[PDB]
Amino acid sequence: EDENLYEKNPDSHGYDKDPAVDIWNMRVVFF
Amino acid sequence: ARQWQPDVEWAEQYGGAVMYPTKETAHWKPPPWNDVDPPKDTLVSNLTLNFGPQ
Amino acid sequence: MLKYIIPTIMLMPLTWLSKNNMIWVNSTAHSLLISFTSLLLMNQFGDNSLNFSLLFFSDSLSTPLLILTMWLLPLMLMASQHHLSKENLTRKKLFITMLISLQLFLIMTFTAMELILFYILFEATLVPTLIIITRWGNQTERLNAGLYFLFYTLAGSLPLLVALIYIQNTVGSLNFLMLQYWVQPVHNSWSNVFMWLACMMAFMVKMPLYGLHLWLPKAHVEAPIAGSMVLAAVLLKLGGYGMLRITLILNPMTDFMAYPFIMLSLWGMIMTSSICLRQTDLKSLIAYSSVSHMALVIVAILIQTPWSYMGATALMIAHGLTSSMLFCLANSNYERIHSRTMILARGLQTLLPLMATWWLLASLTNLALPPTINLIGELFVVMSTFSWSNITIILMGVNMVITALYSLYMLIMTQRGKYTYHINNISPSFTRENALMSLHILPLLLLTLNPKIILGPL
Amino acid sequence: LLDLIWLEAILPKTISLAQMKASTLVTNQKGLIKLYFLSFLITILISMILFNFHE
Amino acid sequence: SMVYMNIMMAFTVSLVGLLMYRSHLMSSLLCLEGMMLSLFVMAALTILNSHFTLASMMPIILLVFAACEAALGLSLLVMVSNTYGTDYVQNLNLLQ
Amino acid sequence: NPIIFIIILLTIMLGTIIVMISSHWLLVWIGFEMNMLAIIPIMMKNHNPRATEASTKYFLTQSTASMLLMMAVIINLMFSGQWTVMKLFNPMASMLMTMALAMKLGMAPFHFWVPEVTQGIPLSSGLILLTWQKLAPMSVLYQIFPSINLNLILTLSVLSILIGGWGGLNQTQLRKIMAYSSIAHMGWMTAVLPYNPTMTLLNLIIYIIMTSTMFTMFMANSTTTTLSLSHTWNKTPIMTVLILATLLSMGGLPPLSGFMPKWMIIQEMTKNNSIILPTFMAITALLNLYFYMRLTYSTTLTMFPSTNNMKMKWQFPLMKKMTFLPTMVVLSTMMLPLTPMLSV
Amino acid sequence: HGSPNWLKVGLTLGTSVFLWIYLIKQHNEDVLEYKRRN
Amino acid sequence: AKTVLRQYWDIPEGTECHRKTYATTSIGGAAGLVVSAYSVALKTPTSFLEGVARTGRYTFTAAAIGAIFGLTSCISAQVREKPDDPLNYLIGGCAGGLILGARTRSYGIGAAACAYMGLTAALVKMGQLEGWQVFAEP
Amino acid sequence: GRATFQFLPDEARSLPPPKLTDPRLAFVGFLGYCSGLIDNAIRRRPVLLAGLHRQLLYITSFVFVGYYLLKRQDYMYAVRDHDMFSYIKSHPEDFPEKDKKTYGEVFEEFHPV
Amino acid sequence: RDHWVHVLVPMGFVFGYYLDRKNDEKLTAFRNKSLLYKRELKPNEEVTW
Amino acid sequence: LQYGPLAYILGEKATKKMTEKSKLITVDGNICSGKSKLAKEIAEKLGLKHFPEAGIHYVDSTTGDGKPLPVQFSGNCSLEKFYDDPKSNDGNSYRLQAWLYASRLLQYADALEHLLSTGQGVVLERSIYSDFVFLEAMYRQGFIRKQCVDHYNQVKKVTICEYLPPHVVVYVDVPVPEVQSRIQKKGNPHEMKITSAYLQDIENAYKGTFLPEMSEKCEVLQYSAWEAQDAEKVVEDIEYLKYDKGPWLDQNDRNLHKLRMLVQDKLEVLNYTSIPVFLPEVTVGAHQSDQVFQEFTELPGRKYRAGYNEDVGDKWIWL
């Protein structure tokens, strides 16, 4: 049928994808 | 689900007899899914000779 | 290019070679590292000229244009991840590899050393774009638009081969642009019309006239995941620049029949921007802005004699950065409200305050506020075609009038309120949503300090 | 009223032009092995009369 | 001389309207075997007055295939009547 | 049955060698006589009443196309009596020659030899064997070449792609879609044959490769275009990616290697100040691509895999010489600076 | 365990060493056949 | 044959407006026979006196086109300024095409018969004007 | 052009030969290196690093054959120019010597905008 | 392990820069020019070739 | 059973194993009558490898090792769910019959595969011919529609071409509908109250429908009583063994017959029953829809990647 997720923001902060090493995705794009 | 429109009607509009594009004409025939043997008519009532008062 | 193609092909057996969800961070890491090396040997000097190595490069000497081609693979992967992350990793590895495979041929294009190396690479695209159009869109009118993207580009480009092979065995060989010192002129005949016309018309089909623009609001309207090849298709349109390589030489003295290309593309300019103020699809609103002030270069190339090439080069990468970001403004704010109807997204400017600046500093580059890269581009075109005939200030001035009322109509539709609905639209424009919206204006206003890097020969 | 009509009238006429003539060439090739060979003979005679072919 | 015009007029026993039409297909296979002797004779008149001494083995070999050819074609024409009983060239099922 | 199936199959290619190994018009008569004798069993094997009513439509079309050839020999027997395979010394002979042989290769006239046979033979398996009969008469037009009228060989070839193109947009049966665009790829090579008759064979060797690899892909189940939908998510999704690559290669797009012939063949067609001749044909094979797009819009976009049937088992057919076909039929465009100096 | 056929496994490893040594000897000869002729 | 063109392209050249359209209706008149012969062969049997092909009007159409096709030129060749030009011979395209527009009614055929015929009209005399040669040899 | 029906004739001795580490011979078989990976991918292998003995002998095939193929490609251009230069050498009436004239002779168009 | 997936792949730069130098060492035609561009007497225009 | 051309020219497999031990036998029966009370009991003396009847998990009962994967991936209409006989549904109750037919066909395609490989007789439970007897009372009870009845009726003339018939086919001792007590006393909680319209109609459909194969040349051995119970046990053991060679065949119809000479009845059935993916190859569904036998494009088209973990279980390097 149809299954789509929401605001990848489970109170946690989140940058790109998920909790951990996706946290390192900011310091590889910002730096 | 959501991704695009892969609808049912795209199979029947491409539904294989003749692919009538811009008109409808004297179509052929819903061609056989198996190998092609509709016309099975082979029979005869064999010869009725009387070797009688010959 | 000594080896810029040789590292960027080595990006390709890195993606599938990787682990699980690390495939996003592994690709974007190394792809930024070329931006030092791209700058590195290039931007050298500089006075007639830099032939680079061999039959594979004239280094894109007087038209740089190529550093912008290398931002994008580390600009689109951070943009495409919004609604892509529901498919299989086996197809997520595909969509990164064909995107790199689009950057490979563009790198040997724009430099290309020849005119027949150009064409086979001019046509080496349109296969990896078409895969991004047909698969990975939304609901239908993908498939006819997948065919309108062909059959204009391919119907025109085949009479190039008839004319380019015709030159290769007429006057020496075309293999170098620097064996183009011996050039016989092209007079007025009945066969030399068609030699000019077939060699020109295949470039008109990509950077459109007012006619034959019928494929441009088809591929951009129905469009991949988050503008993911739509950022590429705006570079590819301005990557039909090669009229600057051809028509400067190689029939130099035919202005006799420029006039049906002038008036069609100078009156069409004042109308095809006027025909957009009643748009109701938001991504089709931008798609006609890309028609109008791209077609100002077509009256800037055919009119020769620089103070136009000062500006016609600066306009190719004027909205290379502007119209990219406007698509990124619309590839965002669609993840939250699932329609591209411009009516529906009201009640805004209170809910998302930090991106109000990203609307304006986009739309302040079409108003163009003279110390940018934009009104250093138009005001050389204006002062050029003034010297063609004085009357052309009228149509080009009303071009400046209507696009002022046009750009603000997209801003001012968000300055309303009370929102009436929308228990969704919560996400307060996360760290990725501002990062890929940045790196657009951060080089755009930076280069306004010393824009001698953005100039032709000239 | 113009941009979706009289630019869209002339070139997608060609889509509906060829498919009008892509139907006259399967639906008139409807079998008729009697009528293959009556039409080979017209082709073999018209090569004699027409042009360069005997010259 | 006139011994070649007749017979080159007699080569038009193909004539293609009567090389596959009309029905009773045996009437069409008839002139396929009868198109020979317009080649077997038209060769034999030329090799024989002009003493070639060697090419006259070719009219002997001209029959040997065309007999074996037409015999093969006659095998299949039983198979169209083995399934029906009548040949009738206005049988057509597999369109084109 | 098994051993005699080779001896029938072996002599098919032995029939066509004598066509090439000959200095004498009698032996080239025998050469593709016995091919027309040794194809008729391969048409039959499972004895279905379309196949018997298809080979007999195949048969007499290649009996007359045989028979006019022997008529063309005996005419220039009368004129100068030489029987070497060379120029034919008579315009009434060569005219009767070329448009007799145009039936075996079938051109645009002599029309329905190509769809009416190849459709509905229950042996769709192959019927790759219809590449020899495109190969035997091309080996005859290499010698006869400096004696033609130059109008007939183009008028059969200008009509070739204009009517082999239009004929199949109105189709579903993918054997006919392979039967069509097989007249078209006989249109590109005999439009060139008067001008430098090599760089014709370049088009032919490419045409054997790209067509042979198309049928081997088809031998999983595929019959009709609707059946070409239902194997992406069922049989192998790598098959869908492969069947995309060859079609887009066989359309002539310059990232692949079906653009290898044209690119070279216009290097010969102009250089002979003939420009309006290629510009017609080069724009004609464009709607020869609208077969292939709108075929690739079936399998590569997940168009309705319904009627849940699971193939939970592996595949064991014989895909012979398949691993090396889409590695020389796609990726060769850089690697051929001179294929036309090996074949020349 | 491992269970191949153990028959042809090595024929592929034995054909190349036949092919390469036939190639290199044909190459190392023909590298000198230039100067032997020219 | 080719000698018809060797009496078409040779003598008149704009003037002598009767023999121009007397010869230029022979060629276009002859091609009505060719479209008649396949329309009785590739199409099935018509009425009792074949060729009676289905709608008729075939050779009725084709010779009428070549009847005016010199006449629209040779009038307008001399009356304006007395050469033969690509803009001269352009005029015979549209109204020459409109015979097929007049019959089998217009508004979708006739202007499309007008437009495309005007494209292929002027290029012919343009062909020898630049010396174009279709079927050539080195 | 004589000495008919050879793969490559005797007279190809004085040609270089085309020795290895040329990028074509690296590329010939690179596609074969790609081809052996396909050979697993057709059959639901499901390895993509499968049996190396199938993944080898593709490399051996193309490189050997492609080398033995290229010895006549460089021959055929060498026999092409060899016959052209001879016909250039005879018949000087078909090959005149053009005059050397500098830019003091030409008065070209002159067309300014 | 030692991650050849990572930074070993940007080390193809110098691998590509090795092939970058091999062309100009056979493109050594002219030491004879007149626009500085001299190669007159000195070990300056000989070096870096 | 042949193995390619090369093995076939050395040793053939038509008749050096089938030394009259073909004896391809099946049963027909009714419910709770001929299940295994008589069928499974006779394997020895005559050496007949019994095959089970049916079930959703027959494809799960092959290709391995081997444990049955659940009804999510093999989504059928769920034995003991369709006993609610949903005359108005989404549904579908016909979608059982598709998987009922394809689990039926692979047993008979392994039947002929086993014989020429080995030479053993095989009892079947219900052949491919029994599937139409259900359709008689599937029709008159209102839980089926037309334009689904015609579908497998069109498959029947497509998929059944090469199948040699069974031999001493037994209609088992079947009562006068005492199955209403047999369906109750023998347990079966979900086989329930549904009245004589499903009881009597299939019983009337064993006689008038199965008669032409019963009147085909392979002689039948019919009983109609309570059970065999040493009255029709040995009588269908000994006097059917006399009907295995002597009173056995009339038009002979099944012998791996007169083309057993390395010809079309010797390999071309034993090469087309090997590798049973070409046997359900024409088991492809409708034109497009058929409104019951469907699966959506991506949901449940995304129920395939869950059933595609690595897509082949185990094969390793170096081999």
Side-chain angles (χ1 to χ4, degrees), chain H residues 111-118 120-129 131-136:
Chain H
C114 167
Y116 183 77
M117 191 70 199
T120 182
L123 298 178
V124 177
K125 286 190 179 294
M126 191 184 292
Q128 74 184 3
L129 191 62
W132 289 352
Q133 187 67 40
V134 183
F135 292 164

Side-chain angles (χ1 to χ4, degrees), chain F residues 1-3 221 226-227 230 233-234 304-305 310 313, chain K residues 8-9 63 73 106 268 276 284-286 294 296 301 304:
Chain F
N1 198 1
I3 296 296
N221 201 4
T226 64
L227 184 55
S230 179
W233 296 92
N234 196 1
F304 194 67
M310 295 297 169
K313 290 175 281 186
Chain K
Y8 195 75
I9 64 171
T63 316
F73 294 160
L106 292 174
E268 281 79 2
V284 181
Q294 284 182 355
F296 290 165
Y304 182 77

Side-chain angles (χ1 to χ4, degrees), chain C residues 148 152 210-211 213-214 218, chain D residues 2-3 7-8 11-12 15:
Chain C
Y148 285 105
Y152 285 100
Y210 180 69
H213 75 281
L214 285 77
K218 300 295 191 292
Chain D
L2 185 142
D3 297 335
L7 296 179
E8 192 69 26
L11 194 140
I15 299 171

Side-chain angles (χ1 to χ4, degrees), chain F residues 234 237-239 242 322 326 337 340, chain I residues 24 27-28 31-32 34-36 38-39 41-42 44 58 62 69 72-73 76-77:
Chain F
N234 196 1
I238 192 63
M239 283 291 177
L242 288 166
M322 181 57 209
Chain I
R24 297 182 306 275
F27 180 70
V28 172
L31 53 93
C34 184
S35 178
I38 300 164
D39 199 357
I42 300 169
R44 288 185 186 270
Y58 282 117
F62 287 97
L69 194 154
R72 64 175 295 168
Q73 167 167 350
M76 191 64 205
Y77 290 107

